[PDB]
Structure formats: C-alpha cells, structure tokens
Enzyme design. Structure first.
Site, PDB file in Angstrom:
ATOM      1  N   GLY A  91      38.960  46.208  46.073  1.00 43.88           N
ATOM      2  CA  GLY A  91      39.553  47.456  45.578  1.00 43.88           C
ATOM      3  C   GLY A  91      40.027  47.296  44.147  1.00 43.88           C
ATOM      4  N   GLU A  92      41.185  47.851  43.822  1.00 50.09           N
ATOM      5  CA  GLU A  92      41.704  47.883  42.429  1.00 50.09           C
ATOM      6  C   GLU A  92      43.186  47.549  42.406  1.00 50.09           C
ATOM      7  OE1 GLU A  92      40.887  51.904  41.265  1.00 50.09           O
ATOM      8  OE2 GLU A  92      38.759  51.529  41.079  1.00 50.09           O
ATOM      9  N   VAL A  93      43.686  46.947  41.322  1.00 55.68           N
ATOM     10  CA  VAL A  93      45.151  46.891  41.067  1.00 55.68           C
ATOM     11  C   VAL A  93      45.474  47.684  39.813  1.00 55.68           C
ATOM     12  CG1 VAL A  93      47.193  45.477  40.711  1.00 55.68           C
ATOM     13  CG2 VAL A  93      45.359  44.675  42.247  1.00 55.68           C
ATOM     14  N   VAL A 119      44.365  47.175  36.043  1.00 59.94           N
ATOM     15  CA  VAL A 119      44.511  45.776  35.557  1.00 59.94           C
ATOM     16  C   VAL A 119      43.620  44.864  36.387  1.00 59.94           C
ATOM     17  CG1 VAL A 119      46.814  46.145  34.581  1.00 59.94           C
ATOM     18  CG2 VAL A 119      46.614  45.363  36.940  1.00 59.94           C
ATOM     19  N   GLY A 120      42.859  45.403  37.342  1.00 55.42           N
ATOM     20  CA  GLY A 120      41.961  44.576  38.145  1.00 55.42           C
ATOM     21  C   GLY A 120      41.090  45.448  39.003  1.00 55.42           C
ATOM     22  N   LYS A 121      39.808  45.103  39.092  1.00 58.73           N
ATOM     23  CA  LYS A 121      38.855  45.812  39.977  1.00 58.73           C
ATOM     24  C   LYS A 121      37.960  44.743  40.571  1.00 58.73           C
ATOM     25  N   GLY A 122      37.642  44.875  41.847  1.00 62.48           N
ATOM     26  CA  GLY A 122      36.787  43.911  42.553  1.00 62.48           C
ATOM     27  C   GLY A 122      36.270  44.516  43.834  1.00 62.48           C
ATOM     28  N   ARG A 123      35.657  43.688  44.672  1.00 64.41           N
ATOM     29  CA  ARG A 123      35.235  44.085  46.038  1.00 64.41           C
ATOM     30  C   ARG A 123      36.504  44.451  46.849  1.00 64.41           C
ATOM     31  N   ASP A 149      44.186  31.464  51.038  1.00 64.06           N
ATOM     32  CA  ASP A 149      43.318  31.788  49.890  1.00 64.06           C
ATOM     33  C   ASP A 149      44.047  31.455  48.582  1.00 64.06           C
ATOM     34  OD1 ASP A 149      40.979  32.578  48.583  1.00 64.06           O
ATOM     35  OD2 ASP A 149      41.435  34.700  48.722  1.00 64.06           O
TER      36      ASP A 149
HETATM   37  C1  LIG Z   1      46.444  38.663  42.917  1.00 65.19           C
HETATM   38  O1  LIG Z   1      46.964  39.689  43.806  1.00 65.19           O
HETATM   39  C2  LIG Z   1      47.719  40.717  43.270  1.00 65.19           C
HETATM   40  C3  LIG Z   1      48.155  40.784  41.949  1.00 65.19           C
HETATM   41  C4  LIG Z   1      48.975  41.845  41.525  1.00 65.19           C
HETATM   42  C5  LIG Z   1      49.437  41.889  40.111  1.00 65.19           C
HETATM   43  C6  LIG Z   1      50.811  41.936  39.898  1.00 65.19           C
HETATM   44  N1  LIG Z   1      51.332  41.967  38.649  1.00 65.19           N
HETATM   45  C7  LIG Z   1      50.516  41.992  37.605  1.00 65.19           C
HETATM   46  C8  LIG Z   1      49.134  42.012  37.717  1.00 65.19           C
HETATM   47  C9  LIG Z   1      48.405  42.060  36.371  1.00 65.19           C
HETATM   48  C10 LIG Z   1      48.962  42.784  35.336  1.00 65.19           C
HETATM   49  C11 LIG Z   1      48.353  42.824  34.072  1.00 65.19           C
HETATM   50  C12 LIG Z   1      47.171  42.145  33.847  1.00 65.19           C
HETATM   51  C13 LIG Z   1      46.482  42.189  32.516  1.00 65.19           C
HETATM   52  C14 LIG Z   1      46.534  43.601  31.917  1.00 65.19           C
HETATM   53  C15 LIG Z   1      46.998  43.649  30.453  1.00 65.19           C
HETATM   54  N2  LIG Z   1      46.303  42.614  29.651  1.00 65.19           N
HETATM   55  C16 LIG Z   1      45.000  43.126  29.169  1.00 65.19           C
HETATM   56  C17 LIG Z   1      46.172  41.268  30.269  1.00 65.19           C
HETATM   57  C18 LIG Z   1      47.040  41.173  31.543  1.00 65.19           C
HETATM   58  C19 LIG Z   1      46.599  41.436  34.866  1.00 65.19           C
HETATM   59  C20 LIG Z   1      47.249  41.369  36.139  1.00 65.19           C
HETATM   60  C21 LIG Z   1      48.564  41.974  39.018  1.00 65.19           C
HETATM   61  C22 LIG Z   1      47.066  42.024  39.259  1.00 65.19           C
HETATM   62  C23 LIG Z   1      49.344  42.807  42.415  1.00 65.19           C
HETATM   63  C24 LIG Z   1      48.885  42.737  43.755  1.00 65.19           C
HETATM   64  O2  LIG Z   1      49.175  43.707  44.725  1.00 65.19           O
HETATM   65  C25 LIG Z   1      49.879  44.875  44.295  1.00 65.19           C
HETATM   66  C26 LIG Z   1      48.061  41.692  44.156  1.00 65.19           C
HETATM   67  O3  LIG Z   1      47.606  41.653  45.458  1.00 65.19           O
HETATM   68  C27 LIG Z   1      48.482  41.239  46.441  1.00 65.19           C
END
Ligand SMILES: COc1cc(-c2cncc(-c3ccc(C4CCN(C)CC4)cc3)c2C)cc(OC)c1OC
Ligand SMILES: COc1cc(-c2cncc(-c3ccc(C4CCN(C)CC4)cc3)c2C)cc(OC)c1OC
Ligand SMILES: COc1cc(-c2cncc(-c3ccc(C4CCN(C)CC4)cc3)c2C)cc(OC)c1OC
Length: 283
Positions: A19-21, A13-17, A133
């Site tokens: 790392g990844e989530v 659900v996320g990729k960047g410098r 941040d």
């Molecule tokens: C900012 O930081 C952190 C964030 C998170 C985090 C927690 N819940 C949900 C998310 C997420 C879920 C789903 C989507 C998309 C995918 C489906 N669709 C296409 C649109 C929606 C985006 C984002 C995240 C990224 C966790 C972290 O650490 C484990 C983070 O770092 C501390």
C-alpha cells in the site's frame, strides 16, 4: 462532545505492494498514515490484534495512534496511524549520511533496546513478541539520533519475512515453528545484518564503505528463496568484514557482535538483552 477524526493527507512518503504511507495532519500535528492494499489486509489485522492485546509504549518502537477501518461502497479501507518521523527510514538515511562512533553506537543500541523490549515477557506487563521482518526499511530515525522499530504486521505474541534477511533455519525449513524462542533467534540474525549495514557507514581513519544491503555481492536484487538458501545454508556465507574495521576498536567490537548473531545454530546466537549489555560496554 466533538470527536475530530479528519486527517489531512499531505505527502506520500512511501508506496509499495503493502500500500502507501502518507504524512498527514491531525489537530496541527504530523502523523504517519499507512493505507493497506487489499493484498496486505492481514498485516493490518495482526498489528491491530497485537495493539488490542498490549498497548506497546517504548521510545524505540514506532508509536501507535490508531487503527481505522472505514466502509466504502464496494471495499473496506484500512489505515494504521502512527507517530511521524520526518528523517525517514534507516535504509534511506544510511544512503545520504556517514556516521561517527557516537552516532553509530546510538543507532544500534536504540535498535537493540526496542528489540529487547519486544522480546521480553513482563508479568503484572506484556507478552513476549517476535517481529519477524526486521530490516533497515522497518527502522525509523528520530531527530534525537535514536531509532525506532516499525511494522508489526508479521509479529507473533507468546506474508513471509523479507528473503534477503531470512535466517538459515527459515531458508532450510528446519525452524522449530512451535517454539517461540525460534522466532526471537530469527530476529537476532536479522539484527546482525542491520548492525553490519550501519557499521559500514561509520568512518574510521578517513575510510567508510558505501551503503549496501546485506549479501549485495552474492545475490541479485529481489533474490529468490533458492538464491538465499544456497548462500546462507549451503555455502554458509556471511557478510564481509573489511580489513579497515580491525584498526578501529568500535568496529572490531561490532564485528565480534555481528558474528555472534550469525551462528548457523540458532541456540548459539546472543539474546537481545546480551547485545544491549555488550553495546553499552563499547567505548
Ligand atoms: C516502515 O513502516 C512504517 C513507516 C512509517 C513512517 C513513519 N514516519 C515517517 C516515515 C517517512 C517519512 C518521510 C520520509 C521521506 C519523505 C521526505 N524526504 C523526501 C525523505 C524522507 C520517509 C519515511 C514513515 C514511512 C509509518 C508506518 O505506518 C504508519 C509504517 O508501517 C508500520
Ligand atoms: C474514533 O476515531 C477517532 C477518534 C479520535 C479521537 C478524537 N478526539 C477525541 C478522542 C477521544 C479520546 C479519548 C476519550 C476518552 C476520554 C475519557 N473517557 C473516560 C473515555 C473516553 C474520548 C475521546 C479520540 C479517540 C482520533 C482519531 O484519529 C486520530 C480517530 O480516528 C482513528
Ligand atoms: C488517539 O490519539 C490521541 C488522542 C488524544 C485525546 C483526545 N481527547 C481525549 C483524550 C483522553 C482524555 C482523557 C483520558 C483518560 C484520563 C484519565 N482517566 C479519566 C481515564 C480517561 C484518555 C484520553 C485523548 C488522549 C490526543 C492526542 O494527541 C494530543 C492523540 O494523539 C494523536
């Protein structure tokens, strides 16, 4: 007894410098798994050290589940495991939705609530914490319409911040680095920018602004430190308040609040607790 540690990684659900989530699964429940790049290992260490010091528990702070370090043949794997918010970041959400008065206020008051909880020292409790941040990508939207603040990898208890959101005293390097209130006042600046991003998406009289990041009209993408210092410090620019806000009592009040987060003099800025009180009296 059995200690079930397997997490199924299901969807990136996320990729960047950084790392990844990943969306993952543990015992039939969604979790979020941040896998750190070797470049950003200190963010894992700092967030882990903070949670080892104080187990923060607040509805407007991303919920901690675990910090994991695993030995690999030639490397160390670092995971942070948190609650999973399927609606994703506020940055994402504001691009695909407009807001009404109630939903705008609920978003910004929930952020203020999380931020005041970080900032306040509680005795007998928690140390005071500055985020360092704060931005819309570091805020997640919950199904109940409140948000929560994420990413304590730069946090300080009593990597640099994202340049677009840096306060003037950071850009001109006059910040009093030995004074903890300085760091709270840098978060307040950033909060005001987030307030502006959200307010733009609140409809009034059939009008809304397009989503834009702060300073979209005066700096490039990935603005340099110097680009930001010239705008914020030398020219003393602040984000534009559109005329249409002044026909709407809520956006008129929010404009005043933003102004009081953006003073050049850090000591003049509102506190998170005062922001909370002001938002509870709007509407
Ligand atoms: C900012 O930081 C952190 C964030 C998170 C985090 C927690 N819940 C949900 C998310 C997420 C879920 C789903 C989507 C998309 C995918 C489906 N669709 C296409 C649109 C929606 C985006 C984002 C995240 C990224 C966790 C972290 O650490 C484990 C983070 O770092 C501390
Ligand atoms: C090591 O690693 C991971 C472990 C777990 C996990 C799995 N089952 C059970 C547990 C558990 C919790 C707490 C106790 C307490 C019970 C009361 N007693 C007085 C003290 C001990 C025991 C066991 C855990 C912590 C999940 C993980 O991921 C989600 C882990 O990986 C990060
Ligand atoms: C890490 O995260 C999760 C962990 C668990 C989990 C698994 N086994 C045991 C426990 C546990 C039991 C008992 C105590 C206490 C109770 C009172 N006194 C005796 C002190 C000790 C603590 C802990 C937990 C909390 C479940 C989770 O979700 C349902 C977790 O969240 C994903």
């Amino acid at each position: 007894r059995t200690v079930a540690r397997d997490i199924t990684l299901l969807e990136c659900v996320g990729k960047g410098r950084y790392g990844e989530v990943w969306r993952g699964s543990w015992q039939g429940e969604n979790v979020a798994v941040k896998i750190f790049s070797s470049r950003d290992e200190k963010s894992w260490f700092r967030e882990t050290e903070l949670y080892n010091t104080v187990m923060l528990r607040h509805e407007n702070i991303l919920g901690f589940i675990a910090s994991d370090m695993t030995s690999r043949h030639s490397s160390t794997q670092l995971w942070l495991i948190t609650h999973y918010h399927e609606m994703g970041s506020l940055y994402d959400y504001l691009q695909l939705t407009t807001l009404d008065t109630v939903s705008c206020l609920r978003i910004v008051l929930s952020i203020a609530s999380g931020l005041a909880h970080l900032h306040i020292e509680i005795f007998g409790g928690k140390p005071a914490i500055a985020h360092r941040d704060l931005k819309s990508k570091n805020i997640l939207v919950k199904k109940n319409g409140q948000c929560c603040i994420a990413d304590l990898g730069l946090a300080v208890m009593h990597r640099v911040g994202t340049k677009r959101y840096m306060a003037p005293e950071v850009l001109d390097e006059t910040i009093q680095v030995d004074c903890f209130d300085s760091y709270k006042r840098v978060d307040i600046w950033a909060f005001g920018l987030v307030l502006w991003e959200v307010a733009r998406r609140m409809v009034s009289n059939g009008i809304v602004e397009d989503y834009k990041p702060p300073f979209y009209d005066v700096v490039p993408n990935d603005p340099s430190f110097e680009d930001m210092r010239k705008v914020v410090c030398v020219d003393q620019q602040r984000p534009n308040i559109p005329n249409r806000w002044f026909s709407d009592p809520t956006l008129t009040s929010l404009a005043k609040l933003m102004k009081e987060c953006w003073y050049q003099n850090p000591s003049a800025r509102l506190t998170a607790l005062r922001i909370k009180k002001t938002l509870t009296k709007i509407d």
